[PDB]
Design a protein around this ligand. Structure first.
Ligand code: CHL
Ligand code: CLA
Ligand code: CLA
Ligand code: CLA
Ligand code: CLA
Ligand code: CLA
Ligand code: CLA
Ligand code: CLA
Ligand SMILES: CC(/C=C/C=C(C)/C=C/[C@@]12O[C@]1(C)C[C@@H](O)CC2(C)C)=C\C=C\C=C(C)\C=C\C=C(C)\C=C\[C@@]12O[C@]1(C)C[C@@H](O)CC2(C)C
Ligand SMILES: CC1=C[C@H](O)CC(C)(C)[C@H]1/C=C/C(C)=C/C=C/C(C)=C/C=C/C=C(C)/C=C/C=C(C)/C=C/C1=C(C)C[C@H](O)CC1(C)C
Lengths: 40, 213, 150, 67, 227, 227
């Protein structure tokens, strides 16, 4: 298992997870707060 | 030499038989790292003990509903309690995470630092929160009858019973959810229907589990 | 001859089973039973199997699907029959009488093939050419004879 | 005349995640790790160039077949 | 292939005789595709698995060949009611071909029992091939005493699988293994015959025999191409 | 040197003729564990002795009261005049209390042999209990055990094993034909060919359930017979 979790820590895999998470957060915010153009 | 989940296959190296309920079952090597295994041992015990409470609670109330004492089904109890007693759902939910948050966080930091909760910081209590083993608190509060402070051989037997009954309860709770989804009825409505006609009322004839049938 | 979402869905499941099998074969033939160099160098045997087996049997099998499924279903579709009233493909396979209605030569079974009376199958093995005037595509009876000949 | 027959080797390569955690393992040049960003591009350009990783034709063929 | 008994069958080749030395039961030197050559063997194409699999197919086929025709024969003799006198392919194994309603449960209820029963029987048998003698070690309600095997997966023997300890001598046991394999190969071909004849004719194996005897010239495969 | 269950078989290494009625028969090797053999020998005696009472009860009752079907004698309305329509719950209360006592007394003897030989109220009364399962003393008032005990034990187990098979024959015959053992025998003799198992095996004459003073008791045949 140590080696497999080491593989999951490589740059492409971390980038995939982090950007999947970051994209999910941005998509879900726009799902619940649609069409935001200004801060009120 | 000890019995294993798949007779003939040697147990994996990291399952040496010391833990309760050790049958060499870890085909995905999820607990290979010793520090991960300690965390998972406690996770299995917390899951098992919650499942045992849930299975017994579901079974008892289902019996009461079956014999017409007025209890709701487990999948309807939540709505009936709040509406009948005029309880704010969000307020009850917040109180639950306060009380569970306090107990869980103290358990969390005893795993990270064993015996750290016994320094007297919580209201002056010292021994009751020292802990005995990973996942086995012990002491006067968690073991008031001291069944872990008597016969060592008896204590090990109880550990084997606890985890096995715990695993069975976890499976049973999975059954309650699957059976409610398939049949839409309560656990003892399902049991009563099966007993009336075992050959023709089972998962193979419920119209869901075997779609091709 | 696909007419329902169920038939499409079942093919998708089978594709995943094949996908798993391909990935298993790749692991198996590299980590477990890896061929030796002499196995790869049997170019004569490889060509025999890829010509007769991969292409020959593949074409024969597909011709089998066309004769027993594609042609009957597309014949009824081009006649205005509603897709849900068309017999399911296995009913065509198991009931020679239904096929004999669409193609009378089916009433004679496979005997004309074995007696070299191949002209009997002219009702579903054709040489029309051109295009089907209803659908604008090739006659499926032509493609079926094509794949038999191939 | 050589007989046409099935011929394999049993268990040639152990199934393990050890090399997944060692980028560039397949090549003698890259297996030592990066010192410049050119290493990163070289890792991907050479990944499937099997014959540049070894001269054994049998080893190349097995990689081709499973790929 | 040469039927009957012979020193070597038709398909025997000088190449096959290099490794087919006659030790295995039923070794008539017939391996034209050379699937039993030990050199550079692996996977499931190896002498042990292939010989084990042939016996397994032989034993299932012998049950199937007798079981796929028994209801028709006993039904003809009147020993069983006509309601259970059914063709092997109409018993519910292939519902599109016909099914029998009258079992104590629907075939999918029965099938689940088959899965659980066969998983235990089959996976335990597998472990004796992978780890010889391992099924006699772990507790199995005291039944592990009869699952020790003998070191040869195809012939476990023991107090149950060899109930009457037949073939006590090596010569006798060798003779019996030959008889088991030849009856098994005959049964395997019979099952293939049942399947092809069902598709070709749509009738049961017993009807096909009765009709061929009634008029052999007008009832055979050649006349069954047409209708 | 004793005769075994079959010719040419070899007795298990743990069956040396010490026990009465030892034919070296253990196909499933259930007795290989020495602790299990002692327990299984006790249960064999219980089945043997209860079965012999069962056969004698069915046979004697059928002769004395031919009009009563032993299979249905358990219904309260069929009880003799003094006990007719007795509360079955109160009747079960006596049996549970009294059988629990004697069975736990017998059970504790297995757990710790020789520990419950003495009367618990009137001290001084004891049973010899020479062997487990053979109390003696008050249980052998006529003193037959003071002789060739081993021969008698052989006779007991031989007749007991025969009675076990005999009683299950009564049960299956009752389910298939709905007649008692002697009534079934008379039916066979009158029409040996028209009345036998070949025709009756397909019929199960037991209802699906019966009502006993307001409690519905499920019933079942031993096979999926046609109701
Ligand atoms: C083990 C945890 C747990 C589970 C499996 C359930 C399961 C259920 N609860 Mg229950 N509850 C649970 C914890 C709790 N419930 C409640 C309070 C209630 C109420 C008040 C109600 C339920 C209801 C329900 C049912 C419908 C769920 C729903 O609306 O989903 C839809 C929502 C989601 C999927 C979001 C989940 C986000 C996490 C379902 C049987 C409802 C019911 O019984 O209806 C008849 C209902 O009205 N639960 C409390 C007290 C705060 C809980 C505390 O842990
Ligand atoms: C210079 C680049 C640029 C800029 C400044 C913006 C800005 C904006 N875009 Mg645009 N956009 C761009 C490029 C850009 N876009 C490009 C290249 C594309 C093509 C892919 C798009 C496609 C696009 C779409 C399809 C949409 C926008 C929208 C938006 C708005 C998103 C606000 C939001 O989600 O608030 C959410 C609030 C936040 C605070 C976000 C951050 C959350 C963290 C947790 C804060 C933590 C603080 C402590 C905002 C006005 C959305 C909109 O409604 O615009 C009017 C919208 O629908 N953009
Ligand atoms: C973790 C397990 C679990 C959970 C989440 C619940 C949850 C619930 N139980 Mg159940 N119950 C459990 C275990 C559990 N039970 C066990 C182990 C038993 C004993 C076998 C019971 C016996 C039981 C009874 C007898 C009743 C419930 C009832 C309830 C409901 C109200 C609870 C309440 O008001 O508590 C607040 C109580 C306290 C803080 C006192 C301590 C609620 C749906 C009630 C119900 O069905 O209401 C409709 C009800 O009458 N439970
Ligand atoms: C879980 C099983 C498993 C494990 C643990 C291993 C382990 C190993 N294999 Mg084996 N292998 C497996 C399965 C496995 N293999 C399978 C299923 C196949 C068939 C394809 C093979 C075929 C194979 C070959 C041919 C070779 C190995 C080799 C290796 C070694 C290096 C692996 C490596 O660096 O991977 C890291 C690589 C990756 C993560 C790339 C994954 C590529 C796959 C096909 C998915 C790509 C999909 C993706 C969507 C493509 C488009 C991307 C786009 C969307 C951006 C190592 C001992 C190599 C070696 O040196 O052995 C001695 C070698 O030459 N393996
Ligand atoms: C690969 C292609 C292919 C396939 C699979 C089929 C298949 C079929 N064709 Mg078609 N056909 C094809 C190509 C094909 N055809 C071509 C190219 C032509 C043009 C010349 C035709 C022309 C044609 C005609 C004119 C007719 C058919 C018919 C049939 C059906 C009956 C055949 C028959 O009598 O078999 C005879 C016997 C066999 C094929 C042997 C079967 C052997 C079985 C599977 C053995 C099983 C053994 C095993 C041990 C069993 C275990 C059981 C288990 C439960 C234990 C069948 C569905 C007939 C029909 O009724 O169609 C609806 C029919 O009339 N075909
Ligand atoms: C390009 C494809 C390909 C090729 C060339 C090979 C080649 C080889 N494989 Mg591999 N294999 C493949 C794909 C392939 N495999 C796939 C997809 C899988 C996953 C299921 C496997 C799983 C596999 C295993 C588990 C084994 C091999 C073995 C072998 C060797 C002997 C094969 C043999 O005896 O075949 C002759 C064929 C048979 C003995 C009977 C196969 C019967 C199949 C299952 C049914 C018919 C399939 C047919 C093409 C389509 C039927 C359609 C319809 C009528 C139903 C050989 C090196 C063996 C080995 O390593 O030997 C040393 C071995 O043990 N292969
Ligand atoms: C592996 C081979 C095989 C398989 C899968 C089948 C399958 C089938 N056979 Mg076939 N059969 C076979 C071999 C096989 N047969 C053989 C070799 C013969 C010749 C002897 C027959 C003769 C035969 C006949 C005559 C009939 C079938 C029928 C059937 C069907 C119903 C089965 C049934 O009701 O079982 C019932 C279940 C059992 C017999 C097993 C009993 C299981 C219980 C739980 C055991 C209890 C044990 C207990 C200790 C009591 C022991 C008492 C004893 C000592 C007296 C089914 C399709 C029937 C059919 O086609 O109906 C339409 C039918 O009439 N078969
Ligand atoms: C392989 C054996 C086999 C199997 C699987 C079946 C299966 C079935 N039989 Mg059939 N049957 C068989 C043999 C078998 N039968 C034989 C040999 C006879 C003649 C004695 C009969 C007589 C018979 C009748 C009269 C009826 C059935 C019926 C049935 C159904 C079950 C319900 C029932 O009443 O069973 C009863 C049958 C048995 C308990 C026979 C058990 C046979 C065992 C498993 C095999 C060994 C028998 C052994 C050689 C001793 C035979 C007797 C002896 C005196 C020679 C089912 C389809 C019933 C049905 O649905 O009819 C429409 C039904 O009415 N069977
Ligand atoms: C106890 C018994 C019967 C008891 C009957 C009684 C009290 C009946 C009472 C009544 O009837 C009356 C008087 C009058 C009725 O109005 C009322 C009732 C109440 C109905 C039968 C046991 C019957 C028991 C039987 C038949 C057991 C058979 C066991 C066999 C054959 C085992 C074989 C093997 O186990 C070996 C030995 C070794 C292994 O290696 C291999 C295998 C094959 C597994
Ligand atoms: C040798 C050699 C050599 C070289 O080298 C190569 C080659 C040539 C390739 C080879 C060959 C081979 C072959 C020929 C084979 C064959 C096989 C078979 C036929 C099988 C069967 C097989 C078969 C089988 C198993 C079968 C089985 C069956 C069964 C169980 C059945 C059952 C049943 C019954 C009773 C009845 C009911 O109602 C139904 C059922 C359910 C159905």
């Amino acid at each position: 298992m140590k080696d497999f979790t080491t593989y999951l820590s490589t740059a492409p895999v971390i980038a995939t997870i982090w950007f999947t998470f970051t994209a999910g957060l941005l998509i879900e915010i726009n799902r619940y707060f649609p069409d935001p153009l200004v801060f009120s | 030499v000890r019995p294993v989940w798949f007779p003939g296959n040697p147990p994996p190296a990291h399952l040496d038989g010391s833990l309760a309920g050790d049958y060499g079952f870890d085909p995905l090597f999820l607990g290979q790292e010793p520090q991960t295994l300690k965390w998972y041992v406690q996770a299995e015990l917390v899951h098992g003990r919650f499942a045992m409470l849930g299975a017994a609670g579901i079974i008892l109330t289902s019996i009461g509903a079956k014999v017409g004492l007025g209890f709701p089904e487990w999948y309807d109890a939540g709505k009936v309690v709040v509406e009948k007693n005029n309880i704010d759902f969000p307020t009850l939910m917040v109180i639950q995470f306060y009380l569970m948050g306090w107990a869980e966080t103290k358990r969390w930091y005893d795993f990270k630092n064993p015996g750290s909760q016994a320094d007297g910081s919580f209201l002056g209590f010292t021994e009751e929160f020292k802990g005995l083993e990973n996942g086995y608190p012990g002491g006067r509060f968690f073991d008031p009858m001291g069944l872990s402070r008597g016969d060592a051989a008896k204590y090990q037997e109880y550990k084997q019973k606890e985890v096995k009954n715990g695993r069975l309860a976890m499976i049973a709770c999975l059954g309650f959810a699957a059976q409610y989804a398939a049949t839409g009825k309560g656990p003892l409505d399902n049991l009563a229907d099966h007993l009336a006609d075992p050959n023709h009322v089972n998962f193979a004839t419920n119209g869901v589990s075997i779609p091709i049938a | 001859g696909i007419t329902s979402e169920l038939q499409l869905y079942t093919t998708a499941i089978g594709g995943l089973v094949m996908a798993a099998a391909m990935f298993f074969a790749g692991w198996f033939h590299y980590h477990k039973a890896a061929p030796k160099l002499e196995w790869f160098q049997n170019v004569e045997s490889m060509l025999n199997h890829h010509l007769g087996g991969l292409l020959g049997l593949g074409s024969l099998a597909w011709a089998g699907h066309q004769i027993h499924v594609s042609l009957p279903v597309n014949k009824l579709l081009d006649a205005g029959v509603d897709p849900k009233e068309i017999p399911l493909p296995h009913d065509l396979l198991l009931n020679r009488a239904i096929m004999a209605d669409l193609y009378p030569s089916f009433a004679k079974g496979i005997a004309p093939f074995f007696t070299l009376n191949w002209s009997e199958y002219s009702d579903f093995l054709t040489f029309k050419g051109g295009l089907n005037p209803v659908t604008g595509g090739l006659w499926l009876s032509d493609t079926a004879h094509h794949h038999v000949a191939i | 005349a050589k007989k046409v027959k099935i011929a394999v080797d049993r268990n040639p390569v152990e199934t393990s995640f050890e090399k997944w955690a060692k980028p560039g393992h397949f090549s003698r040049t890259l297996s030592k790790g990066p010192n410049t960003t050119t290493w990163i591009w070289n890792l991907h350009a050479d990944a499937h160039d099997f014959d540049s990783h070894t001269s054994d034709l049998e080893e190349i063929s097995r990689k081709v077949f499973s790929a | 292939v040469d039927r009957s008994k012979d020193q070597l069958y038709v398909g025997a080749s000088q190449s096959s005789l290099a490794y087919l030395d006659g030790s295995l039961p039923g070794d008539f030197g017939f391996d034209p595709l050379g699937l039993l050559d030990p050199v550079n063997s692996g996977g499931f194409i190896e002498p042990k698995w292939l010989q084990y699999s042939e016996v397994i197919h032989a034993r299932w086929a012998m049950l199937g060949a007798a079981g796929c025709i028994a209801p028709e024969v006993l039904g003809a003799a009147g020993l069983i009611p006509d309601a259970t006198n059914i063709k092997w392919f109409e018993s519910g194994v292939i519902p599109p071909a016909g099914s029998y309603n009258g079992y104590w449960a629907d075939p999918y209820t029965i099938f689940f029992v088959e899965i659980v029963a066969m998983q235990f029987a089959e996976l335990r048998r597998l472990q004796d091939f992978r780890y010889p003698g391992s099924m006699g070690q772990q507790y199995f309600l005291g039944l592990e005493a009869i699952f020790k095997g003998s070191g040869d997966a195809a012939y476990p023997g023991g107090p149950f699988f060899n109930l009457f300890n037949l073939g006590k001598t090596e010569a006798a046991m060798k003779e019996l293994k030959l008889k088991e394999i030849k009856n098994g190969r005959l049964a395997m071909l019979a099952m293939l015959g049942y399947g092809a004849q069902a598709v070709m004719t749509g009738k049961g194996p017993f009807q096909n025999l009765v009709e061929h005897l009634a008029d052999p010239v007008n009832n055979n495969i050649l006349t069954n191409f047409a209708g | 040197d004793r005769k075994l269950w079959a010719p040419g078989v070899v007795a298990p290494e743990y069956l040396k003729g010490d026990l009465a009625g030892d034919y070296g028969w253990d196909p499933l090797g259930l007795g290989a564990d020495p602790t299990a053999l002692k327990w299984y020998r006790q249960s064999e005696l219980q089945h043997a002795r209860w079965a012999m009472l069962g056969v004698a009860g069915v046979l004697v009752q059928e002769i004395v009261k031919p009009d009563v079907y032993f299979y249905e004698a358990g219904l309260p309305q069929n009880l003799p005049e003094p006990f007719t329509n007795i509360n079955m719950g109160g009747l079960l209360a006596w049996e549970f209390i009294l059988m629990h006592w004697v069975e736990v007394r017998r059970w504790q003897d297995y757990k710790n042999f020789g520990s419950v030989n003495e009367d618990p109220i009137f001290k001084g009364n004891k049973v010899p209990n020479p062997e487990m399962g053979y109390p003696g003393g008050i249980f052998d008032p006529f003193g037959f055990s003071k002789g060739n005990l081993k021969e008698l034990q052989t006779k007991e187990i031989k007749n007991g094993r025969l009675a076990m098979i005999a009683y299950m024959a009564f049960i299956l015959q009752a389910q298939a034909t709905g007649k008692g053992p002697l009534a079934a025998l008379s039916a066979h003799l009158s029409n040996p060919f028209g009345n036998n198992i070949l025709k009756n095996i397909g019929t199960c004459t037991v209802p699906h359930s019966v009502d006993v003073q307001g409690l519905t008791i499920p019933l079942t045949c031993l096979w999926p017979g046609s109701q």
